[PDB]
Amino acid sequence: TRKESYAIYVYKVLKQVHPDTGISSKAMSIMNSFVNDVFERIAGEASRLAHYNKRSTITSREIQTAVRLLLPGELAKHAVSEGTKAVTKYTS
Amino acid sequence: ESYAIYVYKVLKQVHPDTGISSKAMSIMNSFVNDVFERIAGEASRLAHYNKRSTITSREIQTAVRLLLPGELAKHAVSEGTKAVTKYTS
Amino acid sequence: QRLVREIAQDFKTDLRFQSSAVMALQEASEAYLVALFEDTNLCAIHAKRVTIMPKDIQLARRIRGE
Amino acid sequence: HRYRPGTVALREIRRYQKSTELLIRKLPFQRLVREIAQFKTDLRFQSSAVMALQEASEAYLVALFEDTNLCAIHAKRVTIMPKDIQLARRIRGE
Amino acid sequence: KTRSSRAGLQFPVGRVHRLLRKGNYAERVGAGAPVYLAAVLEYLTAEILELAGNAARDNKKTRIIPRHLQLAVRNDEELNKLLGRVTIAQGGVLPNIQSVLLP
Amino acid sequence: AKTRSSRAGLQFPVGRVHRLLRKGNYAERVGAGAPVYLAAVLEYLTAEILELAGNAARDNKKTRIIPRHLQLAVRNDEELNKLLGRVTIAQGGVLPNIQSVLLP
Amino acid sequence: DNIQGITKPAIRRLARRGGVKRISGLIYEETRGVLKVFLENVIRDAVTYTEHAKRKTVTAMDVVYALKRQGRTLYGFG
Amino acid sequence: DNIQGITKPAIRRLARRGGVKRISGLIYEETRGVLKVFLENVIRDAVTYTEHAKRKTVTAMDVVYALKRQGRTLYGFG
DNA sequence: CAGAATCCCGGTGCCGAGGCCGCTCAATTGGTCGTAGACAGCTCTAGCACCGCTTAAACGCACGTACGCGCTGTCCCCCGCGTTT
DNA sequence: GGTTAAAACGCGGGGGACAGCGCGTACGTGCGTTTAAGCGGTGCTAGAGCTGTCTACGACCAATTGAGCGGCCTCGGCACCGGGATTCTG
After folding, report:
1. Nucleotides on strand J with an atom closer than 7 A to protein CB?
2. Beta partners for residue A58, in sequence order
3. If both were cysteines, with which of F3, F20, F61, H2 could D32 make a disulfide (CB 3.0 to 4.6 Å apart)?
4. Where in the sequence is the domain holding G38, given as residue range(s)?
5. Which DSSP letter does residue H4 get?
6. What is the C-alpha to C-alpha distance for residues G18 and F49, in angstroms, rounded to an integer?
């Protein structure tokens, strides 16, 4: 039976940030674990926030708040910048 | 609303001639809320790991067994089982 | 209260506080410092010293994971 | 010819910090796990489970020993002693 | 009649049921979940209050105060484990002095 | 017809993230922009970590990225070390570190 | 400089509660720095929560949520 | 008595990886006790998960879930 | 300066990282509908500010010996190596 | 069932862990002076909070169809083994 993964997407990213570089299967599994872990953290924080303000809908604002709360230092700044850029381009 | 009156009703059964301050009442309120949140979240995880729609008494029991220490957990399970049995019988 | 106000000014100008919001901060801070000193005293004793030293505090924070 | 006491100790420190392999033998560890898993009689295990247990255990022991060494140094000693481990686990919150 | 009366408990089953159905934990809830949880909560509350009262009587008092809750919780092996990471306001600490400091 | 990933200029899949959100018991409704923002964040983090991984691989004269390289990259960066301070990586090993008082 | 408002005898008092017999002369500044760092983190989180809530006043529940986020649950201010 | 299978050379190698230069002769029993306690806790949680799952076989995901429960978060096993 | 460790250049060949081809199912679009909640408006109370007051408390100074420290003698035990199971 | 990597056992003796001493001065106990922390009283109002519009938004449904997980060859990045020159210790 078929199962979901992130391997191809990670490989596409890697081929963008290192045109000539291979990645082992163990590394791919670790990366899948990391992606899943971060996704869970952000989603749960967003739900907790959405519950605090009695909102039925989780919107980009809650996600941004969650990310800001969760990532330390300039990394949060860059993350917010990237997300905002992506959303802005998405609307147009 | 809160659990204040219910805490009182519990208090009077284990210590008739005693009182309790409002600060203690708030502390107990927080404790009840905290334990409820812990158990509920654990049960929600367990119900997710097995891909089941419903949280059942079995799920809550699993959560309790995971969360509490032993001697406490055993008595908790016994009380819950007695209560759920009396609920139907 | 003045210290809390001063350090809060660095995140959002023209804020306002609740009395309980400050009481909670004071409670948490006092408890945190009490625990820190409790561990630091053990550290100093393990060092076979009565006096408590900053190095003991640093060791306590390091081992604790801060 | 002899290397002076501690030299080979440093050599081992370097080489084992360089390497990434496991240090505990698999068969003894598997026997230990399957012995202390007797909670529920007549159990069955996936190999990956024992591998993850071994990984986590070795990681936990390394992390503990690091603080043990820190304590011993704080005590102005080279040799680690059980009291150092006890202090580490006390401060760590166990 | 109230479900608590049927179950012989003291905490309200119905409010727990509503909180479960409202707190976004799953798609469905079994009839027995709230009763079991209420029983557990009642047992824990009774345990805490019993120890608190014992602590209060030990100091010739009739009203339970946060200091008494602190003493009861911290003077127990398992409750302390359960509430290791909880700070109680106006709770204080346990009196103890290291033996290497007394003359 | 064009994919939402393409419409957003991202490499991670918007749709799968949307489905995981709507099938994860997090809220009653999900905003149309939440998955885009989240996918952007995840893609940025992935690129960020992979850059240091590839730098480690180049430093160690290797073409493939191995868990030891991931360990080195994560622990050699302060922000990542704070973010993943409670994560154990299999076959990752540790950092070379000898105290100055142990050696003459 | 309101950090100096955390008086030397106040720090001695906290230590006495902790069970410290003799205090060195540099403990006070180190404690000042530690407390500053801790308060900075907690306040940053609390103001983050407030600004997300669109409030201007900082509620106590926000302090509670922040302390929970740090991992120090507080009973009483609920 | 399989706890004696965690041999002195193995513990010495682990310490070496930890950065210890000189090891006392009494470390090994304490290490054995600590390892036993940790393994007991994790295995108890894993067995609990397995019994809830209605499985004879203890899966790796169960071990991962226990470690996540205790705050270790092992990567590389799904 | 013996000699134990280590790095270096080179050859062997394999197993695991990858490209290509198939085809589920899931991602997109167009469309309908209910209502979430952003917003518009009216209400008022803890927070904040100023003032005189009591007095709780911090602080500088005197000065003693408690104890933190450097140094010494010595013997407890751990490492490093070789042998056996 | 076989191979051999490994663990355990003996020994020499160097490493350092320990008990003890004389010494210096840091922090303790105590006092007198100064500060401003708390009271409470009076006052204003910023901003939290409670009544209510309506359309912006997401959930849901049908139909379409190509993006993603997989199977199967493919082949070269790397470990392994070897002979040798070369740091480092003692």
Report:
1. 6-8, 13-18, 26-28, 37, 46-48, 57-60, 66-70, 77-78, 89-90
2. F30
3. H2
4. 8-70
5. G
6. 43
Paired tokens of E1 = 């009649």
CA H64, CA D87: separation in Å to the nearest integer?
A: 29
Any chain D CB within 8 A of the CB of C28? Answer: no
Alpha-carbon span B84 to B87, nearest angstrom: 5
The CATH number of whichever domain residue C53 belongs to comes to 1.10.20.10
Touching check for G42 and chain A: CB below 8 Å?
no
CB contact under 8 A, H78 and A30: no
Q: Which domains does chain A have, with CATH numbers?
A: 1-92 (1.10.20.10)
Q: What domain range includes position D51?
A: 1-94
Residue contact F83–A4, C-beta within 8 A:
no
H76 belongs to a structural domain: no
How far is the alpha carbon of C66 from chain D, nearest alpha carbon, in Å?
11
Does H77 reside within a domain?
no
Note whether A68 contacts G: Cβ–Cβ < 8 A.
yes
Whether the Cβ atoms of residue H75 and residue F89 lie closer than 8 Å to each other: yes
Residue ranges per structural domain of chain E: 2-87
Min Cα separation E74/chain B (Å): 15
CATH number of the domain within which D39 lies? 1.10.20.10
The verdict on residue G2 lying in a domain is: no
Per the structure, the count of domains in chain G is 1
Q: Per CATH, which fold does F3-88 belong to?
A: Histone, subunit A (1.10.20)
Question: Which of C:5-24 have CB within 8 Å of D?
Answer: none
> What is the count of structural domains for chain D?
1
Is E22 in a helix, a strand, or coil? helix
CB B45 within 8 A of CB E28: no
E2-87, what's its fold?
Histone, subunit A (1.10.20)
Cα Rg for chain G, rounded, in angstroms? Answer: 16
Within an 8 Å CB–CB cutoff, is residue E87 touching chain A? no
Question: Would the CB atoms of E45 and B57 count as touching at under 8 Å?
Answer: no
For chain C, the domain total comes to: 1
Å: A47 CA to I29 C1': 29
CA–CA dist E5, E15 (Å, integer): 14
Residue E21 tokens, joined: 């159905």
DSSP state, H57? E
Distance CA B39, CA B64 (A): 7
Q: Which residue of E has its CA nearest to B10?
A: E46
